[PDB]
Design a protein around this ligand. Structure first.
Ligand SMILES: [Zn+2]
Ligand SMILES: [Zn+2]
Ligand SMILES: [Zn+2]
Ligand SMILES: [Zn+2]
Lengths: 175, 175
């Protein structure tokens, strides 16, 4: 039982799995006939409706950048979950993906547009394990799980450490 | 940087880590001088204030029961997160742990007391990967992650499958 939406339905990455932004079901590999070579790893699952507006170089996942080239695909779910409630999530997931996909990267400006801070998320200097969902990051990459190099974690959890002021963001352009 | 609360502060298990119910920081092993042998694995981190009211047999984690004997320690965080908001979580975490610890097991009655269903959680027959936090289970055990044997997943996520009526619960006594 996999996702059966039109292949132009956006995708996000949680832990290992590629999931559909529309139905939240695991996404299988695209038929290669539909695959969009110009979109690296993303094109292996996502086939947009029209142009691209930006491209993705096919590559291997680095110990810190995964999916290689568009690690922000990994921040879509955590930002949406920490930024919505029970009867509000779908709408949120859809708006968060659209924003990020459009920008083709994660940036302080895209986080402001998404009101991540006003909704309860705070960055924290990683000093140990953090339970639940979150966005781990450094000055160039982000992930939904900890990784070698990550220096900060974005969470809505009332942590013991001291939150970073709202003007702070570990990166300028996480890709 | 670990937890530095009084050792009588309750504990919960998320993924691998043992975390403190009070400060949400990782919990180190108890000095063995404080360790409470009568509380199996739990006693290796948690030292109550007075009696026990129930005991825990020391053992090895089974492919389906972990922590061995009190796998419900793994359901504390997911139930609390899916059942609270941003400015409400701590209170929720504290009430959820106390309830479960008292009952010394997870049961349909303890889930009703915690109003898991009225707050948005629904059980679903596992048919594929599910992103985010959740409680995986079968008729005898539960976990915060999928495991060989699990047949159902409790989530507040608006999944595509069809939710189980509110009278349904995969188990009668998950320990
Ligand atoms: Zn879909
Ligand atoms: Zn990257
Ligand atoms: Zn503590
Ligand atoms: Zn068990």
């Amino acid at each position: 039982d996999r996702c059966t939406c039109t292949p132009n339905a956006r995708v996000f990455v949680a832990e290992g799995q590629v999931y559909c932004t529309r139905c939240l079901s695991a996404r299988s590999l695209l038929p290669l006939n539909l695959q969009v070579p110009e979109l690296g790893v993303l094109g292996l699952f996502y086939r947009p409706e029209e142009p691209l507006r930006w491209t993705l170089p096919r590559a291997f996942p680095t110990v810190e950048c995964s999916p290689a080239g568009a690690c922000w695909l990994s921040a879509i779910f955590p930002i949406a979950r920490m930024t919505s409630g029970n009867l509000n999530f779908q709408q949120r997931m859809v708006r968060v993906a659209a924003e990020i996909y459009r920008a083709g990267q994660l940036t302080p400006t895209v986080l402001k547009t998404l009101q991540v801070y006003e909704r309860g998320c705070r960055w924290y200097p990683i000093v140990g394990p953090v339970p639940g969902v979150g966005v781990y990051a450094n000055s160039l990459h982000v992930s939904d799980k900890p990784f070698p190099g990550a220096t900060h974690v974005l969470t809505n959890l009332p942590l013991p450490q001291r939150p970073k002021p709202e003007d702070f963001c570990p990166f300028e352009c996480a890709m």
